[PDB]
UniProtKB/Swiss-Prot annotation:
The keyword Disulfide bond applies. Its EC number is 3.4.23.22. Disulfide bonds join 255-290. The keyword Hydrolase applies. One of its GO terms (molecular function) is aspartic-type endopeptidase activity. Residues 17-328 form the Peptidase A1 domain. The active site is at residues 35, 199. Belongs to the peptidase A1 family. The chain holds residues 90 to 419 of 419 of the full protein. It comes from Cryphonectria parasitica (Chestnut blight fungus). Keywords: Aspartyl protease, Disulfide bond, Hydrolase, Protease, Signal, Zymogen. This is Endothiapepsin. One of its GO terms (biological process) is proteolysis. It is an enzyme of class 3 (hydrolase). It catalyses: Hydrolysis of proteins with specificity similar to that of pepsin A, prefers hydrophobic residues at P1 and P1', but does not cleave 14-Ala-|-Leu-15 in the B chain of insulin or Z-Glu-Tyr. Clots milk.
Length: 330
């Protein structure tokens, strides 16, 4: 089997992407944030504290003839940005782009943190990291991909995120029309539960490539590119007036700037992030100070190849017995 679904930016900055997902019978379609950096599929629901729901579409398990309470199971997750959610668990039928999994754990939110409430466009998350990170207790549950894998034509999914435009998540096949040149594959460590890999270096603008190993995660659920402070300083040094602002919480730059590109290495291959992808707009409405899309990972504890990086590529998440990641230009 295969599936193919369009993923759409939630706003004009590509802060996140939503993908429609069918849950239950009859289908209830929710727009979920596909997150290769986590492993829980959780939704706003009829059980979510009423004051914490503000415009989201909710899953109502009582209206699904295939929903079953997973007795005794609870979940609770805290994300890197300090957001969080928790609740109980149903199993139900879940379909993405024509690909159906029966008995998928659908984690129903009883509580969500303010950032989730305040984002009316995201109805929940669909985790695509390794199932070892799934938070369901006392019986850990599998991700949608893990459940689907054996049925897929090939045990892969691909992320093709757009810049200020829709893109695509495919399951079970590689669309050879969706990228240019060849796909370069690179090793993955699953030791931390993430799609963790080692970039071979970077360049800033038209500058020379610096060969250096940068271990990080491919994380579709993180907006920005978080890299070591040395790398980030080298980038922003090429932008007149750019500075790190502790009050704002990262590098800012004059909105009048033209940003240089940033290149990262995948083996001997190179992915170029155009300068415009690195512009996250005014820090507050009407400000001429703009927020940078490349930020320091210092004090996160891990480097993160988030959407800023991934949307410059066609990315293969290869879930074969030994997982790997592939990157192609597009």
């Amino acid at each position: 089997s295969t599936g193919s679904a369009t993923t759409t930016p939630i706003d004009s900055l590509d802060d996140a992407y939503i993908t429609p997902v069918q849950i239950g019978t009859p289908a209830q379609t929710l727009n979920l944030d596909f997150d290769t950096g986590s492993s829980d599929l959780w939704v706003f629901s009829s059980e979510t504290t009423a004051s914490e729901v503000d415009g989201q579409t909710i899953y109502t398990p009582s209206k699904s003839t295939t929903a079953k309470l997973l007795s005794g199971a609870t979940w609770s997750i805290s994300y890197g940005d300090g957001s969080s959610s928790s609740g109980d668990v149903y199993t139900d039928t879940v379909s993405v782009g024509g690909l159906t999994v029966t008995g998928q754990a659908v984690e129903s939110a009883k509580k969500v943190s303010s950032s989730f409430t305040e984002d009316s466009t995201i109805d929940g998350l669909l985790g695509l990291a390794f199932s070892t990170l799934n938070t369901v207790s006392p019986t850990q549950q599998k991700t949608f991909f893990d459940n689907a894998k054996a049925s897929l034509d090939s045990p892969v999914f691909t992320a093709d995120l757009g810049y200020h435009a829709p893109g695509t998540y495919n399951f079970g096949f590689i669309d050879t029309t969706a990228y240019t040149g060849s796909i370069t594959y690179t090793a993955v460590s699953t030791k931390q539960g993430f799609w963790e890999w080692t970039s071979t270096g970077y360049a800033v603008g038209s500058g020379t490539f610096k060969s250096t190993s940068i271990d990080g995660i491919a994380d579709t659920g993180t907006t920005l590119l978080y890299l070591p402070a040395t790398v980030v300083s080298a980038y922003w040094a090429q932008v007149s007036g750019a500075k790190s602002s502790s009050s704002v919480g990262g590098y800012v730059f004059p909105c009048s700037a033209t940003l240089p590109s940033f290149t990262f290495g995948v083996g001997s291959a190179r992915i170029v992030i155009p300068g415009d992808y690195i512009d996250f707009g005014p820090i507050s409405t009407g400000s001429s100070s703009c927020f940078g899309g490349i930020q320091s990972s210092a004090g996160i504890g891990i480097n993160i190849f988030g959407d800023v990086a991934l949307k410059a590529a066609f990315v293969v998440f290869n879930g074969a017995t030994t997982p790997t990641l592939g990157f192609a230009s597009k």
